[PDB]
Amino acid sequence: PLIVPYNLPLPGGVVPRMLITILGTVKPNANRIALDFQRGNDVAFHFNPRFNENNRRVIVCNTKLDNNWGREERQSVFPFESGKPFKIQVLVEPDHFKVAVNDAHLLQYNHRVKKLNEISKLGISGDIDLTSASYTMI
Ligand SMILES: OC[C@H]1O[C@@H](S[C@@H]2O[C@H](CO)[C@H](O)[C@H](O)[C@@H]2O)[C@@H](O)[C@@H](O)[C@H]1O
Ligand SMILES: [Cl-]
Description:
With 138 residues, the protein is mostly beta strands. It has strands at 6-9, 18-26, 33-39, 42-53, 56-65, 68-69, 73-75, 85-92, 96-101, 104-110, 121-126, 128-137. It is globular and about 35 Å long.
């Protein structure tokens, strides 16, 4: 029962073969969830399930540099369900973050921020009960 928003330090940043696992349950009538992999004030990878954008469910991914959001990448596969437990796994690979939800591949997001070893925090926020957040080298 972690408190959201939750900050998970990523010591020495991320690197290929690092697997980040987030376990929680979506609140009833959820509106949003966000993962923010941060390089200081920059957001290297924002992963943002939206449960009601014009009565559609969509995941928005983006990067924030010098306080400016870039060009969004959108995924209409939407594996989250209000009220239900989920597992998000983010595997860092050489060219992208690779995301699986509930053991099914979801999307990849190419690295825009190049200094992976400076992406040293993960913020987890939004309409969830957060059970755990951790990493391991695989
Ligand atoms: O791009 C991800 C980013 O989206 C914004 S909402 C976004 O704001 C821009 C201007 O900054 C446009 O107005 C666009 O139509 C849309 O409203 C926000 O949700 C942020 O947390 C992040 O998800
Ligand atoms: Cl960079």
